Amino acid sequence: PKYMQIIDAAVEVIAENGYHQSQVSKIAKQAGVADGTIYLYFKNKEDILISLFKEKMGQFIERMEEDIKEKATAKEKLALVISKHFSLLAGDHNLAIVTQLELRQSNLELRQKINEILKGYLNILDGILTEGIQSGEIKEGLDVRLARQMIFGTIDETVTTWVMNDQKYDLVALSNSVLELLVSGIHN
């Protein structure tokens, strides 16, 4: 529909120009819709940014949630999380620019709305960690919140570095090396 056409054109425009520099009129023209047609679907530019993130994250979570059911151990569940995270962003370079640079807004009001959407993804990491402790696979007395922040922070930094290096190298191929580091640490 026209809705997804605007969403996709927004991903391209925001990635290319930056969020604040982006023009709603330009997003419309690239989507192939009239200027007024965008406002039938979105309140403003902020609504566009939040909705595209909510949408894509919403798709990513529901795929992830059912996919990790097939995997028994916490290590296997985390392996899939990392490879899927890396795979989605490697498949479309515009997406990585949005996630690593453009969604990193400093305005408290806007950033809280962004981080609210992030919560669903981090919740999956929490579940993997809590059930891992239950089985005795994951360290007992380990802080789930801190481990969640290590896992996400590590994955995120790997992506950011890749983005800053013009995405010239294979991000997906780093999946297993990242997993082992998070599993056994630097001492190993």
Return the number of the residue (72 or 165) whose C-beta is nearest ligand ST9: 165
Under rule CB under 6 A, residue 73 binds ligand ST9: no
Q: In 11-61, where do the E strands start and end? A: none
Pattern 45-64, ligand ST9, x by CB under 6 A = -------xx--xx--x----
Q: How many residues bind ligand ST9 (CB under 6 A)?
A: 30
Sign, Cα dihedral of 179, 53, 106, 118: negative
- Region of 76 (left: φ > 0; alpha: ψ -120 to 50; beta: rest) is alpha
CA atoms within 13 A on the CB side of 80: 19
Per the listing, tokens 């609210």 go with 116
| Interface region with a copy of itself, contact rule CB under 8 A, candidates 1-9, 36-44, 64-72, 102-110 | 102-110
Q: Does 20 bind a copy of itself (CB under 8 A)?
A: yes
Sort residue 18 into left (φ over 0), alpha (ψ -120 to 50) or beta: left
- Of 99 and 175, which CB lies nearer to ligand ST9 in the complex structure? 99
Q: Which residues of the shown chain bind ligand ST9 in the complex (CB under 6 A)?
A: 11, 52-53, 56-57, 60, 85, 88, 95, 98-99, 103-104, 114-115, 118-119, 121-122, 145-146, 156-157, 160-161, 164-165, 168-169, 174
